[PDB]
Design a binder for this molecule. Structure first.
Ligand SMILES: CC(=O)SCCNC(=O)CCNC(=O)[C@H](O)C(C)(C)COP(=O)(O)OP(=O)(O)OC[C@H]1O[C@@H](n2cnc3c(N)ncnc32)[C@H](O)[C@@H]1OP(=O)(O)O
Length: 197
């Protein structure tokens, strides 16, 4: 059942274990190791770093959206027991990028939902962001999720092109239609990529 696959994925110790060669990224002057852990397996400073980076990167965009920036609410989302983190480490010490994701039931399907993918400014445009989303798609396959899903702000033109063009995400059926937010277009789109099987 749908329940069963989601529960099984959340019982994994290390979902990235099935793809050992993807635990390193050494391209374009980057040399990082990549780990996948429950939020419970991170040091508090790492969780704080991830939140701080998201706020630095996203606060202004949230403020111009229908949601606003909810400081406490974002911290609680990112520290939830069900959260998984993909973290890229430089020099065995310094976190420089992460994705926070969950295995969940979304519009009735077993899906890997990506809440955040965030990179430090200094490591952007070197393929690492694409690599992290690739890894999410690998994990979706090995756990037999039906899609990887996420939400993007349309005003975030870079991230929008990143997902729609570079990664060929499509607009999900759950994305609110035109005139869908209080009689007007929503500032965001829900995007997805189906797993192939
Ligand atoms: C669910 C989410 O979190 S939605 C919000 C996404 N996160 C943010 O906006 C936070 C700040 N930005 C980032 O963290 C990163 O820049 C990301 C995640 C958006 C993209 O990761 P990056 O590593 O920088 O991109 P990456 O190097 O992998 O780009 C691959 C391709 O995506 C496209 N792309 C990436 N960034 C851009 C951009 N700013 N403008 C246009 N196209 C882009 C390009 O086609 C690029 O290929 P190219 O360099 O050969 O032209």
């Amino acid at each position: 059942s749908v329940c069963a696959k989601v529960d099984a994925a959340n019982r994994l110790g290390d979902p990235l274990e099935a793809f050992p060669v993807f635990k390193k990224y050494d391209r374009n002057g980057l040399n990082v190791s990549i780990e996948c852990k429950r939020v419970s397996g991170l040091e508090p400073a790492t969780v704080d770093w991830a939140f701080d980076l998201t706020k630095t990167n996203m606060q202004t965009m949230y403020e111009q959206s229908e949601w606003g920036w909810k400081d406490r609410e974002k911290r609680e989302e990112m520290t939830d027991d069900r959260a998984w983190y993909l973290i890229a480490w430089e020099n065995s010490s310094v976190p420089v990028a992460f994705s926070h994701f969950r295995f969940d039931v979304e519009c009735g399907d077993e899906v890997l939902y990506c809440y955040e993918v965030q990179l430090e400014s200094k490591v952007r445009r070197k393929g690492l962001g694409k690599f992290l989303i690739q890894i999410l798609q690998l994990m979706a396959n090995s756990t037999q999720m039906k899609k990887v899903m996420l939400t993007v702000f349309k005003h975030n033109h870079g991230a929008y092109q990143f997902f729609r063009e570079a990664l060929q995400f499509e607009i999900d059926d759950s994305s609110p239609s035109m005139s869908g937010c209080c009689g007007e277009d929503c500032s965001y789109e829900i995007l997805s990529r189906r797993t192939k099987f």
